[PDB]
Design a protein around this nucleic acid. Structure first.
Ligand code: MG
Ligand code: MG
Ligand code: MG
Ligand code: MG
Ligand code: MG
Ligand code: MG
Ligand code: MG
Ligand code: MG
Ligand code: MG
Ligand code: MG
Ligand code: MG
Ligand code: MG
Ligand code: MG
Ligand code: MG
Ligand code: MG
Ligand code: MG
Ligand code: MG
Ligand code: MG
Ligand code: MG
Ligand code: MG
Ligand code: MG
Lengths: 134, 260, 167, 182
RNA sequence: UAUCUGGUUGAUCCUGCCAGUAGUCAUAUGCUUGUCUCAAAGAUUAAGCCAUGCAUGUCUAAGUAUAAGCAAUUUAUACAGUGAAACUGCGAAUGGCUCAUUAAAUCAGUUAUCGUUUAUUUGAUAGUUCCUUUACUACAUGGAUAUCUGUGGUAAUUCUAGAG
RNA sequence: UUCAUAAUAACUUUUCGAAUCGCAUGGCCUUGUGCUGGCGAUGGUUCAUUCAAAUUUCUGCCCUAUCAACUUUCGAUGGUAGGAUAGUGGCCUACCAUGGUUUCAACGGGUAACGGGGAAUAAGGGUUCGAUUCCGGAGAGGGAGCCUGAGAAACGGCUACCA
């Protein structure tokens, strides 16, 4: 037996964010940890809404296995999900993609450097050139 | 030290925010608004920590932005907007209307209300004066100034503001044997009748209040907010009709009304 | 390095407290007042550079300064300015005489034109009209309110002077 | 500058270290209930003392006085729930007469022993530590768990582990494997 | 959670201390140290001195784009998509750290402002700017200056001169 | 209350009373492109209020008499008028008066003193600690002085001197 008895407890219907929010309580028996993707799929099947319009986060195993408790939101449309859900979560899901920043330190340094010049530094470049030459 | 303070530490917050000790160092400081900092209730708190429609500050902000929350008809977009006593919070989606009233214990209660009551706001009178060009104005203890008031409206009198325009529709004179609500101190959240009004012309008038169960108590005049004529309030009061049980009584109630 | 400040006189460099308004300084905070060293208004044997503005043209030429012209980069932006530049008068319309710039990516031929500021739009006119209306309306409302109040006062005074009779 | 976390020292050492009789008593107690430390005993004593303090205070107040009626009553209820006080003695005056044995005879240790499942206290302790024994389908690791009287009916082996019927695991499994291809 | 015990004598009863005993969100330190949760941490001496990096910046349909920026494509022949810079606005007086000063000072509870200032906020709110009333800018006034383009100064700095 | 407020007198190097932006593109024909009109942003006057602010009342601080008199030319205590300030006030200035505090410790000295919430101990009473997560207050090497601003005598602002 694998079972995976999924439950949506504490269901708040939320029109203000176009979602349904609930505590996900899932049963394991003999199987360790449900995996998020699978859970999402299950939720989608339950609720008829698209798999990408489902979001599940913040899970903990009961201690001694058997159960997992977490938090789940099901948005009305995929568009809705896109425009209300945090970016990291979206990335995790597979919808939105990773933003490619440098390490924050580098950014800070860059900013500081920028501070040190007044205006766009094309004139400055020219000055450096010509002055360097003679 | 140097100008106004702009942060609020989590412990220094009003206790009736019901804010948890952990999960953060800071509390949402109410912005400059209609209600006093300590007597207010920021929109964020209302949204996240009461109704649970938002999970975090970002969510709350998002909710605010799509122009959906309405404090006293007017829109609002501040996360830290200080909605206080008698303020009507209307959500366009859900079609729920709320009035911010206290409960038996002290904190702000989630009090669901119909559209027929949500149209008006009830407000105490703080000041009555002639303004510029000799024009009389009334000041509500809840923010407003209303020009050309009915000239037998005095201080401490409560006023039915129609909210949609902001005009006085009707009023209650402050007098003995009139239904009252307590808005400050230990007795805050309690409903009563006004048995007697002590004066002490110099510092702080004390009003004696009896509730429905014949149980007298005394509070300062500026903590006392008229609500109607006894038995017949102008607004709907929250569950437990501002009554205050003893602890034992409360326990008994909890026990005897078990239905798990 | 040090610049020449106009007004100092003196054939030597001097320290000055410099604020917003006067040169030899760009303030980085509002009301910042750096004490900076600056060279005088008198030319000596110690200067590296003189800055010379040639006002009267002469007999001979200097290669690329008297013979040659640099085009003015930006046409006027204000409508009145535009009018002035061309010499057009008030009834002639500004839109048509706006200086165009031709930009090409390599294939796409494209034109740039300034937003004429202080131009008589219909929108502007409408706004003005609305403003005019609004104040008037407010005034009317106020008057009405005052009248009502007066009436109320009258019909309370009367009431008072009905119980002013008695024994 | 985050809000401070509350600690509380949950035991108290004796005010005189080598009181020989006392020491022997402690040892005896340990022997009885398979206690790893004197520390456990001390903890229990501390707990008892706290209760006593409350009870004494309550007594000091007038009887039928609100506070006594409430808090004392609550305490009594708690005690009954835990199973330390008996139904004969819901009194508050009897709360003072409790003594350390009644708390130790209520641990998930002793309870486990006294329902079968064990053969001596040490064995029971081992089982508890070893993640055998569940209460309400919840595997309890803690030897000093304080069984809540109504939950005492439910003490059983886990659905995981052997003993309560699952995969044998580790040593048995190894043995089986060895047997297999020979 | 009301407790004492060893030491003045050949022995005794005291006064008395010293010594032990227990605790310390009390520091140090000596040995050891498997796990879980929680987590103080350059205060004490020197409010002694500081390499280097970072810690306050900010733009929406909605103050100002002719970047000679990117767009590029089926709202522009005034602009109108994004948008670096710069002007303007606002913020930088909050936060964070530390305890040197300080003994009616600070501070705590308590009053008072009929003794004042207060960006912001949420309410309010201004037909009267005219100046004699037969031909008047109001279908909208003026001159700048930033970025930018060019000419430089200095060993150098978030130094700025000269012109357009 | 000489308050709110109103009124007469005038004054003023006459403050403010929208030459500002975005999206809407609706209603009457006197058929102009006419007159109009919606939802908003920023602004701006005084009064509110709110976040604040300066002061301010009464009562309460640890050791010390091997500190008993202290303050008052250079303001000490009070008066009058002015100046100054956001405003009250010796806050400062002029003229005048001689007060003010103190064995119920003034004043001075010390603190290895920031104050409080609190902490350790724990029959009852106490004793010791509180640089430190919250609330006040100070300070940015030391002392001054200011600019900008609603708000700073600011130091990740400036000006000087000393180190
Ligand atoms: Mg009063
Ligand atoms: Mg414009
Ligand atoms: Mg296992
Ligand atoms: Mg004692
Ligand atoms: Mg002797
Ligand atoms: Mg001897
Ligand atoms: Mg000792
Ligand atoms: Mg493990
Ligand atoms: Mg140090
Ligand atoms: Mg700027
Ligand atoms: Mg600070
Ligand atoms: Mg007056
Ligand atoms: Mg005076
Ligand atoms: Mg000190
Ligand atoms: Mg101290
Ligand atoms: Mg302290
Ligand atoms: Mg120190
Ligand atoms: Mg230093
Ligand atoms: Mg300074
Ligand atoms: Mg620094
Ligand atoms: Mg600072």
């Amino acid at each position: 037996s694998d079972a995976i008895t999924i439950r949506t407890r504490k269901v708040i219907s939320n029109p203000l964010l176009a979602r349904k929010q609930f505590v996900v309580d899932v049963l394991h028996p003999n199987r360790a940890n449900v995996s998020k993707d699978e859970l999402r799929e299950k939720l989608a099947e339950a609720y008829k809404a698209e798999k990408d319009a489902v979001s599940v986060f913040g899970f903990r195993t009961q201690y001694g296995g058997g159960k997992s408790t977490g938090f789940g939101l099901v948005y009305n449309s995929v568009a809705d999900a896109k425009k209300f859900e945090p970016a990291y979560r979206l990335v995790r899901y597979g919808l939105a993609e990773k933003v490619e920043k440098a390490s924050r330190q580098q950014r800070k340094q860059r900013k500081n450097r920028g501070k040190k010049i007044f205006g766009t530094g094309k004139s400055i470049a020219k000055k450096a050139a010509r002055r360097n030459a003679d | 030290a140097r100008g106004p303070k702009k942060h609020l530490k989590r412990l220094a917050a009003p206790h009736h925010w019901m804010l948890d000790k952990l999960s953060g160092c800071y509390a949402p400081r109410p912005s400059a608004g209609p209600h006093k900092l300590r007597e207010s209730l920021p929109l964020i708190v209302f949204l996240r920590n009461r109704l649970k429609y938002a999970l975090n500050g970002r969510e709350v902000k998002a909710i605010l932005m799509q122009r959906h929350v309405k404090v006293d008809g007017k829109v609002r977009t501040d996360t830290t907007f200080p909605a206080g006593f008698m303020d009507v919070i209307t959500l366009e989606a859900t079609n729920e209307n709320f009035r911010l009233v206290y409960d038996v214990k002290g904190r702000f209660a989630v009090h669901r209300i119909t559209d027929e009551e949500a149209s008006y706001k009830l407000a105490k009178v703080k000041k009555v004066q002639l303004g510029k060009k000799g024009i009389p104005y009334v000041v509500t203890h809840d923010g407003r100034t209303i020009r050309y008031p009915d000239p037998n409206i005095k201080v401490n009198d409560t006023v039915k503001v129609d909210l949609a325009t902001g005009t006085i529709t009707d009023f209650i004179k402050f007098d003995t044997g009139k239904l009252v609500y307590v808005t400050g101190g230990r007795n805050l959240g309690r409903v009563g009748t006004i048995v007697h009004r002590e004066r002490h012309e110099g510092g702080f008038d004390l009003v004696h209040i009896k509730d429905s169960l014949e149980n007298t108590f005394v509070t300062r005049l500026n903590n006392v907010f008229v609500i109607g004529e006894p038995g017949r309030p102008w607004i709907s009061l929250p569950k437990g009709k501002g009554i205050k049980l003893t602890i034992s009584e409360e326990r008994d109630r909890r026990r005897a009304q078990h239905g798990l | 390095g040090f610049p020449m400040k106009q007004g100092v006189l003196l054939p030597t460099r001097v320290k000055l407290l410099l604020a917003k308004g006067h040169s030899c300084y760009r303030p980085r905070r509002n009301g910042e007042r750096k004490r900076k060293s600056v060279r005088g208004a008198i030319v000596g044997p110690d200067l590296a550079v003189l800055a010379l503005i040639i006002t009267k043209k002469g007999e001979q030429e200097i290669e690329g300064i008297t013979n040659d012209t640099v085009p003015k980069r930006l046409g006027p932006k204000r409508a009145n300015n535009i009018r002035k530049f061309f010499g057009l008068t008030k009834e002639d319309d500004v839109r048509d005489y706006v200086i165009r710039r031709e930009v090409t990516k390599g294939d796409k031929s494209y034109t740039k034109a300034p937003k004429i500021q202080r131009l008589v739009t219909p929108q502007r006119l409408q706004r003005k009209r609305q403003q005019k209306s609004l104040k008037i309306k407010n005034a009317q409302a106020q008057r009405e309110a005052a009248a009502e109040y007066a009436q109320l006062l009258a019909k309370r005074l009367s009431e008072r002077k009905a119980e002013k009779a008695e024994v | 500058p985050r809000a401070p976390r509350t600690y509380s020292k949950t035991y108290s050492t004796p005010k005189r270290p080598y009181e020989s009789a006392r020491l022997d008593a402690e040892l005896k107690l340990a022997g009885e209930y398979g206690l790893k430390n004197k520390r456990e005993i001390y903890r229990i004593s501390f707990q008892l003392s706290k209760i006593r303090r409350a009870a004494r205070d309550l007594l000091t107040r007038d009887e039928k006085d609100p506070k006594r009626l409430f808090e004392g009553n609550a305490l009594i209820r708690r005690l009954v729930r835990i199973g330390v006080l008996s139904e004969d003695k819901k009194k508050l005056d009897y709360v003072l007469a409790l003594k350390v044995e009644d708390f130790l005879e209520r641990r998930l240790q002793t309870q486990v022993y006294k329902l079968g499942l064990a053969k001596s206290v040490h064995h029971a302790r081992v089982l508890i530590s070893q993640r055998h024994i569940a209460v309400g389908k919840q595997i309890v690791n803690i030897p000093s768990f304080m069984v809540r009287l109504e939950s005492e009916k439910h003490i059983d082996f886990a659905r995981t582990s052997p003993f309560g019927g699952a995969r044998p695991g580790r040593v048995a499994r190894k043995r089986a494997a060895a047997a297999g291809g020979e």
